[PDB]
Amino acid sequence: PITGLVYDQRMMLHHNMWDSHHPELPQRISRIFSRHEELRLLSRCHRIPARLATEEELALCHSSKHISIIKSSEHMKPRDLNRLGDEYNSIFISNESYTCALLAAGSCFNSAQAILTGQVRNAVAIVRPPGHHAEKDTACGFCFFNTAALTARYAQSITRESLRVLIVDWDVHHGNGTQHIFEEDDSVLYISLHRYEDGAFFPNSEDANYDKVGLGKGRGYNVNIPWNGGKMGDPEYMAAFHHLVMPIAREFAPELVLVSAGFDAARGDPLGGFQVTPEGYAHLTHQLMSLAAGRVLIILEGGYNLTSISESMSMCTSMLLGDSPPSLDHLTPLKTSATVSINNVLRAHAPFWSSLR
């Protein structure tokens, strides 16, 4: 039972040359890595090397146009970088951005490979820029390429095309990119918990609502758990995992679990407004470890309180290493809004999933 870990300082090169205090900071991965040292968790892990993703691998989820455009930004002057970045929804670009996105995906490919070949049982991927907002043909929300989505395809490419991989997205934002890429796919189960606020919360789309359950043969394999009007926390997420995520995931019976692990739902996050605790993320992690024979890859997405995400993700690694879950705070009754959300998803997925009725 050994846990993998991948981190590369080079992914800090991605930076905003106008707003040096833009929340998607280079130090995000630095602080998480550092926190692993202080808790002596790093030594307990097998260090998995990072690498560049190939354009061939990028093409698993992304158009030729999108790849070439981002590839070109590498040799651009700042005025053009400003220009190009402005064409997207919430995107800043530097000359090192393309390489960093490649390193994020490549790092997660090696981690998945290590898990699927049995070298490690599970792994954590401390990477940036994030990925779940990135679409097939466009960049969005600090994301250039959809790392978790690409990792699912790579995983299938080195085993079999029908390898059942589950993607659990507990980043506070909806992974619009990930949902769309697999919306017609029954081999990749996408489960997302996110702040919705009737579509007022980023990325401001109604695709994130519970009624969007997938298309074609992918009907029922897209699960949206939206939160409305309320500071959701550990009780609401534990309830959603108990009633929805885990029973659906068990029925799906994944062979690989990918976690789009953003920590912007964490308490203290400048953007999230939620209050999930580090203890909360640990229990979520531990819960997911009971699936796919423990084959779990935890991939960093969002999260912008340097202290919050450092503590939160370290707690997840501690769980993968086999340590015992810390006790949760005394569990408040669910916020009335949560029960509404949970029941709607229940109703919307009860036909496709036997364990829900």
Ligand SMILES: [K+]
């Ligand atoms: K999410």
Ligand SMILES: [K+]
């Ligand atoms: K799907």
Ligand SMILES: [Zn+2]
């Ligand atoms: Zn986010």
